[PDB]
Amino acid sequence: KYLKSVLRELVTYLLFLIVLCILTYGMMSSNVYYYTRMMSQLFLDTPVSKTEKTNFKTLSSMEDFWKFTEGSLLDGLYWKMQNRSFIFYENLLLGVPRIRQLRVRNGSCSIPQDLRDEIKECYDVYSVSSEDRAPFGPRNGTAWIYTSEKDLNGSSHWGIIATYSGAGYYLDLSRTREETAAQVASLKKNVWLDRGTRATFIDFSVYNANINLFCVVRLLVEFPATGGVIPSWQFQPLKLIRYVTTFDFFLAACEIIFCFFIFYYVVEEILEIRIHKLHYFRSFWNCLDVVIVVLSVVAIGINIYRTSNVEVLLQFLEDQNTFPNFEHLAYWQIQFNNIAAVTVFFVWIKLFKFINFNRTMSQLSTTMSRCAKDLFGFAIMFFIIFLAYAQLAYLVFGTQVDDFSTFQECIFTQFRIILGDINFAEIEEANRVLGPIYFTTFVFFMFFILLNMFLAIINDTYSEVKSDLAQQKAEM
Amino acid sequence: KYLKSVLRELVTYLLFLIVLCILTYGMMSSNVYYYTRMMSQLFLDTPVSKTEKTNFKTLSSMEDFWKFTEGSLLDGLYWKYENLLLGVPRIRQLRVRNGSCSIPQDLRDEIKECYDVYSVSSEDRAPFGPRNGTAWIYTSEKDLNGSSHWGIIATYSGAGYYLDLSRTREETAAQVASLKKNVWLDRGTRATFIDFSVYNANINLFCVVRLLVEFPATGGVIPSWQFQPLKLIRYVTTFDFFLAACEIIFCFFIFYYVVEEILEIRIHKLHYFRSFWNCLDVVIVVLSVVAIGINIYRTSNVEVLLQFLEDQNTFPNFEHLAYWQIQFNNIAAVTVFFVWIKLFKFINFNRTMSQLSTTMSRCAKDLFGFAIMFFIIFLAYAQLAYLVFGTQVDDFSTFQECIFTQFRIILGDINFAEIEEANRVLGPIYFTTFVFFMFFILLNMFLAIINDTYSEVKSDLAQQKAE
Amino acid sequence: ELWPWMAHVLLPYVHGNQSSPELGPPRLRQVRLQEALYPDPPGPRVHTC
Amino acid sequence: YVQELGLSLEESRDRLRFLQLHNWLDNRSRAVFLELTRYSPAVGLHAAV
């Protein structure tokens, strides 16, 4: 046999690949790019005021933030129509933007008594157990009163320094600039960004009715306890009103067919595991199917969890003078994309099983497979030295370089050096004794010696495989 | 018998190659670069206004365009580089119509109109504004010699609302002010073309210039430009007589080659498309025939511009000439490449060269069979990067952009300042797993094949020589 | 310009309302050599000091 | 040769100008060596500047 059985097993895979490709082409269009590009350039690439050149992307002080919040921010939220506020005369600013603050309390840490004459207070780094909850300043509104995480429908964020909660002191802004500017001025006069503040969030969203794509915008600013400002941004093109055009029904039908295909595969895998050979995991061709089906079922579960959860849109459509809460939907969309992008990768990778249709491809596959059993040991022995260099660099230079400021950053820096991108022109300033020594040793031992065993093993394996397959003709 | 025929073939090929090399090199004059560079620096670098710096290259709003059409454009066109105008410039507009969606019923009360992305089925053929003339009435594509353009976002049609300006500054300024006073650049606009041509009598070189401004359905402005210089006299001195003689002898050479090929294929019914040195000769012949046809087509109608130096008052339609010039260049530049490559059959007369030739001819099958397994993984990574980074980096926006970015990464030109911040997880994973599977594994396999085959072929050839 | 630099950016950094508690006054230890130098010919520096 | 650079802003600035005009740093004066301190109670780390 081996032919009349594989032909069905091949066409069933080809149809699966076609459906997956249709889905991938469907979700990713070419209109999201320019949408997000203009949306980002409107807020990030514009100076706070015409008399300086410090944009939100390069904030450096607590004072610059106030210049930003009344400035390039208000100028890019409210556009006078030739009341509603269309950003680019196409994008609709639905709802109102909301600002929020996360801060810690006075006396959150301890100082020694021998120098407790000059140090009058300390503000410890942000922690859920050290977060202030008392009302400060003038106790008028929601901007000076703590609010629990469940009363804001919020969640965690996982910023750059730490993972911030969903609570804090929040404030909703108006619809016209005339009142939003007054509110911001009121916040700035009665000092609101004190020394105790640790994080600030700004959130809003737009519609852009021409195409059907919501865009949710979040801006984070972090204040480390050691001083400084760290900005971050996130623009997400969500889509929530899918069924309008025929292509949408086409995509839904392809999704249904995809679910049917994955159900078929899981059934034929359970049948094979139970009604046939047990513990068939020494193949790498069946350990790939389980990964694909698990990733697919996780993606389907996430889609069912998220798509069926859209009542927040209905609540916003009831009254459209309140802040819409679309933060969870963007997070789940990001998670769904991160899963689909890996699923399609493995689906494409699986195609290698189907290419043995002549001598050359078969022998290349044999060489590639036989060369994996022994490359594994050298890969481990090489990665051990790689991590040794990584930890050495992290311990030595990981305090002044900022390219080695984190372990994974050290790994990426080493890989970039391997590609030939990073030069040590700053390492001497970082260190003059152990800098050039480390650089020379790394670029000599792991680029002239260690990196050639990979070539040697492959070269020898291919040579012996070809010689064996040629000798396989002296017997026949 | 072998040497005689081989040397005859070699000498004929050398004459063909030298004729082609002279013919192509005589078509490149160094002033074309200077002309295009100065034209671009004049129409695209000068500030829109004295107090502003937003040149045409950095347009950012539908209002800056209205300043450009009254600022740098008029100054550059109606100058004090020392060129003169011919004919009259034309400005054309492409719009879409209101009501092109099925608006969701939920929020249909808030919004009231779509201006959908540009398409043939959604074009606005109805009149609008004051129904004065051509500037407010739809004109069919056939009525006006038009053709597609293939802009950055989409391919546009040849129809639209057109208007022809005047010759001097005052009337064109008045017409532009009249267009600005009314709403001509409405919210429904999707494309704006400005077209004209100049002569620059100082050095004989026509120039056809086309500027395009695109308004995507999500706001913003996308500018693009195209400057095409032309030389269409070609009979001025002895040099171009030499060029014409070279042209005619080239035609004779290609005639001889095609008749030889047709006789040869008459002899061998099939099995003739496997030597791979005939499959390339036929490609060269076909490319040369296409090039000569294009040259005949674009030299048949050249007289039409002659009655434009007499200072007429109309629009000179010069898109076809520029397009066919570009096409003819893009064909010459490939037939030259292939005729140069074909030369790899007359340098096997040595010993080392013969070994290299038989090496490359003996390891072509493995290289081609492995370029499939390499490109499958390459495309898998391309699709992964497109799905993850295809919205915010700007280096993975389109699909082919991902492939080109990966090829640049192979040359060691990674940025990594945006890959790591666009997706903190699954981005660095992609970057690290891409370098380990390319520089360590998949680029050490080509060398292994080329390292084994060379040794094998040298051993066999040395044994045969010593046999 | 060292004096304007210190008077403009450093002194406001050391003192102030709260302004980054210091734990210690500054110092200006300084060496003289006693072997009076002469300016080099025009040009910043030829090889080294 | 050291300088304490005062305690508060006004006296320190006045003494700085006083030593500036009296030619404290215009002669040979190989180095200057300004270095004071830093300490962050929130994290519990000192810094030599």
Ligand SMILES: *[C@@H]1O[C@H](CO)[C@@H](O)[C@H](O)[C@H]1NC(C)=O
């Ligand atoms: C912070 O607390 C300290 C002591 O814990 C005390 O001086 C006061 O309550 C706060 N500091 C200031 C400057 O108000």
Ligand SMILES: *[C@@H]1O[C@H](CO)[C@@H](O)[C@H](O)[C@H]1NC(C)=O
């Ligand atoms: C706070 O409330 C008081 C009295 O209720 C009012 O006078 C004041 O304007 C409010 N806003 C402030 C202090 O920012």
Ligand SMILES: *[C@@H]1O[C@H](CO)[C@@H](O)[C@H](O)[C@H]1NC(C)=O
């Ligand atoms: C949070 O969710 C509740 C649930 O209905 C909603 O009423 C409320 O408006 C939301 N927002 C806040 C700030 O409570």
Ligand SMILES: *[C@@H]1O[C@H](CO)[C@@H](O)[C@H](O)[C@H]1NC(C)=O
């Ligand atoms: C676009 O069409 C809608 C359809 O009802 C209409 O209400 C709206 O007024 C139109 N736009 C303009 C600018 O008239």
Ligand SMILES: *[C@@H]1O[C@H](CO)[C@@H](O)[C@H](O)[C@H]1NC(C)=O
């Ligand atoms: C349109 O009307 C006539 C021709 O139809 C013309 O004289 C006039 O100047 C044009 N413009 C306006 C604003 O009427």
